[model samples]
Target: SANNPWTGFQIFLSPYYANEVAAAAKQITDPTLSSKAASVANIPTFTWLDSVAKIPDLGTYLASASALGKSTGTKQLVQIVIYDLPDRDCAAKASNGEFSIANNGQANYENYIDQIVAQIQQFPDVRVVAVIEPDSLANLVTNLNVQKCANAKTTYLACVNYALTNLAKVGVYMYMDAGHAGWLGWPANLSPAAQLFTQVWQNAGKSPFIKGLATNVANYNALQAASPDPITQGNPNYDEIHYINALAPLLQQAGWDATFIVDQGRSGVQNIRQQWGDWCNIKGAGFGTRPTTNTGSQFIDSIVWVKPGGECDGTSNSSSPRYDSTCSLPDAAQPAPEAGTWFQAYFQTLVSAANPPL
Candidate 1:
């Protein structure tokens, strides 16, 4: 793949450099530099997870992060995860003994989309790849019925329509989810991602929204392996590569010549248990297929890390009282669990150096 270095001279305009080079010449403070500042300020102004508890100047961060590669002819990619989906009740009343924050339930889902739209306006003509929603379509297929799946599809279309309506005032191509084929063996389950692409386009009518489709949102290298090639399943390798190959033809038949991305954020650091667990916390994973448009396969486009080394969905122990506790700081005041607990005894061992595995 060809490597493109990031623009190097944009630092003077960054807020991080604002105080440092408050009075650089307009030549040094070019439009690209100023917009880099906006890109830094804009992304976090809209999303929450990146900030954790505070908004970060993403532009400055990327600027510094990209410095090493700037002159080397290699540009680092920036991936943002937009997690809320119809399948997820980020605002749903807490049940199943999970975290019960009433305000979390009351957060206006529609407004989040609006917030992102406004944020993108900060960088009018900047180019940045957005990984839309990780597992948005994948989870819908794994858990929801047709009605529920469609609702999730609706949620995505609504957000994408609003975001691009304004951001496209610049340019943002949005890719919806396609679970690794292991999770979406039946073509119908994954089809909604593509169908919604068209549906969103129709909703806006003459307005164009949605870039294409994204697949293999959160599974490990193994699941991706299972999808494109089949022998891996049930064998010692049992990756999902076979299933991915199965859906490519179907995705083409469905008229979704969409671009695809893989999450290779932590692939180099993947562990065996982390790769297959349907549920495991902080489980590191990597990309199985090369992420690029047109791998000789007609349906796929590109692979990327939409979810970069994220914390897992739930805690190690399913028996924990307050599920949200795990969502807190990694090393909190909370004491370690009893020896018999799944998280304490066995699972955490793989991740822990000091603790003994059950």
Candidate 2:
């Protein structure tokens, strides 16, 4: 569940989350970590799946337990899979047989959609926040050709429609993906983006479809609380923290009910890069916006982590050390920091007054 406290603590989305968890898991050496784990392991505050990214089938037993917990007044705990939308080339096509963007030539959009829909339909009564696909639309509009863009859009719509009409029936909040303000230019363009998502609904002919839109998918930044600087429209490198505020109005005009959630999965420690440099150094970049439930804007919804904490961003090694966004496997000499390291760094950044935790 995106709203759950434990969901964003994974390491892959942000080294911060991954490092934090690793540190905690390794805290057997540190009394504090052992103590923290002892206190947290049984509690549902942090839910980590040891299996692969696929959403495992949950029959009546798990659903019964979840429903029972909720009936007893427990917090609504739902596990949503937001990434498996179309244009999954970035995931090395994990859902599509390890085909990454670089090697997406063999990527089968239809096949991917089929698998995703089938898996999602298998789970009953489990609430989910399906992010629907990240960066697919934005990347298409930004880089691909018209034909490719249309194809991608079609594929995205198919997946969203399936999840919404079919999966939503089983209790899922289907929020289609939209790039963060930083990537979407200005607020004025939000109308078009909203229209795009709405077009998705219209094309699929799926009524009462998705709940809303999702932003900052992989960036792991906050939407409502992003920085205040005004981003110049058309620049791919616009700062998300500040751009969403100015850009949100555009979405409102397009008829989107709300801006949906932000990917705060690993953004507690975000790098404040002004432009394309964001891809280079992402370690502990303090969030562009502060984490929060209220976006302080009508168009904005709650903030959530669409990405996880402990997984790798890319590879860490590069011939050019100065521009390495990839995280390498930890070695004996300079071993990778445990997940807790990133968490600690994130917590440290949250020390300020405006960014207090909820």
Candidate 3:
């Protein structure tokens, strides 16, 4: 398509993160790491949309986005992860949303979406890309044994359908999460995942309703790699591109003409520690390809840093609201900061070890 409707793909940098990095940089005494921190501090990123906490201050988010859009003379492209699905993240407690089904979660979720839409409608000119519900759809097919997962088989679809029906319109670009390569790339799960995604999109009213599908959001799966897989053997489905190639056909067969986007912030450092399934604050992750619409792949839209580096994915220590063994592995990064906080040391490590060396 035309290079990218988002002001030539100019990314939006949140003032909140810029200030956080500026202050955190001073605390990093290592001259080299400190400079790297400052370098990436202003790199544009999406402003997260946590309905639980951020919806109340919706005006502030719009004001910032609008001011930036006005100053730069480009439609501020903002990325919002529509989290907080009912019984969210059934596979893990870490990153669990504030709402649950037992307490009118569906109603609350719809209301929250309403608030978000109202806020965005206020900024008619600001370009908005909503990465709907990070782990919600993926959990439905993978974690059926979880009690909430069983509930989500129906409730989740309803919530998501409501969101797509309302949010997918003029000025809004909706990219539904297709999980990551690690979760859906397997032989057994791929077809089912594609089928489910197609059904969800169709049920939500289909086609023009969504711009494309987003892969590996907030997950660290390389965009391209050459590792071997027993399933595919010799030419392995080692990264997001491979996985998307496998998935695109299935989705198209089901009548989906969607594009793709990938989160590569943590895909830059592959040799740190080997574990494709590891999803927490990974040990040696770094910044990957910068946001760009020119992905070359006909089915892919852009490579984006959906999960801003330095924000703790989750935590293992008592300080965190949620705890999971995945975050406490002996090899896992220690002293995990609470989710969303600045992990200064981790940030420095990512910057220093970046694949293209940042």
**Which candidate wins on TM-score?**
3
Model 2 vs. true fold: TM: 0.62
Name the runs in model 3 displaced over 4 angstroms.
Answer: 1-9, 226-235, 318-321
lDDT winner, 1 or 3: 3
Measured by TM-score, how close is model 3 to the native structure? 0.92
Per-residue CA lDDT of model 2 for 185-304, tens digit only, reads 555555556566666656544444365666676564444334443323354334454555555555456554445566664455433434432432244443233334555554445566
How much does each candidate deviate from the true structure in C-alpha RMSD?
A: 11.7, 7.5, 2.5
Highest lDDT among the candidates is held by which one?
3
Please, what's the RMSD in Å of model 2? Answer: 7.5
Residues 17-69, model 3: lDDT tens digits: 77877887888888987887787766666667665678755557667878887
Of candidates 2 and 1, the better by TM-score? 2
Query: Candidate 1 lDDT (Cα, whole model)?
Result: 0.39
Error of 3 at 36 (Å): 1.9
Write the candidate numbers in order of decreasing lDDT: 3, 2, 1
